[PDB]
Amino acid sequence: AISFDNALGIHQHTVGVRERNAEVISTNIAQANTPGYKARGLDFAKELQAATSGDKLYRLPTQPDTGDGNTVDLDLERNLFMQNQIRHQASLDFLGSKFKNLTKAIKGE
Template sequence: MAISFDKALGIHQYTVGVRERNSEVIASNIAQANTPGYKAKGLDFQKALSAAESGASVNLARTDGRHIPASMAAIGETLYRVPTQPDTGDGNTVDLDLERNLFMQNQIRHQASLDFLGGKFKNLTKAIKGE
């Protein structure tokens, strides 16, 4: 009997990648906190997760017929956040406290998904060994 990893691993195999992408977006916001005119960005987690689950991909343009066709997984688009603090005069919309909290929350959820995946693999290993 063949093992279906999609059924065995569930949604957690997709949430890990989306959480990693979300970390990159939040880290970019934190890094740009003092850049004048920078607008804070965010990731719509539900849309990104749906795109990851469906296996959506973006075909990359080829400028020459001899180029190798390529695609990359679509992990959701980044959107601009609605500012939560008044403009300080430089046009930057990053709220450092909010970004740090979002980063920690995302990391906790990322770790939870990794723990769930580890448990799934542990159970699969037990099943294969017949324990």
């Protein structure tokens, strides 16, 4: 034992995935008005598995498009972006406390 992997856990890979998800969600919000653009989804479980050791998912629209072809539901995108930011803040707190505890033990302070 006594290794950074065994000490940090999955809180280092989770942060990267949460930032990846925010990039995907922000892309859907920006491309909301572009006709023909299809909303992009991200699988957290698969992304976390790939990050730990190392495809395109589309979001099914709740209602038909008005003709443009864009399936971005901006009501859902804001809700997911808000959730992603909260869980990302927790992951930073979880990962940040891993380093603080490691520093505390190696210095006894």
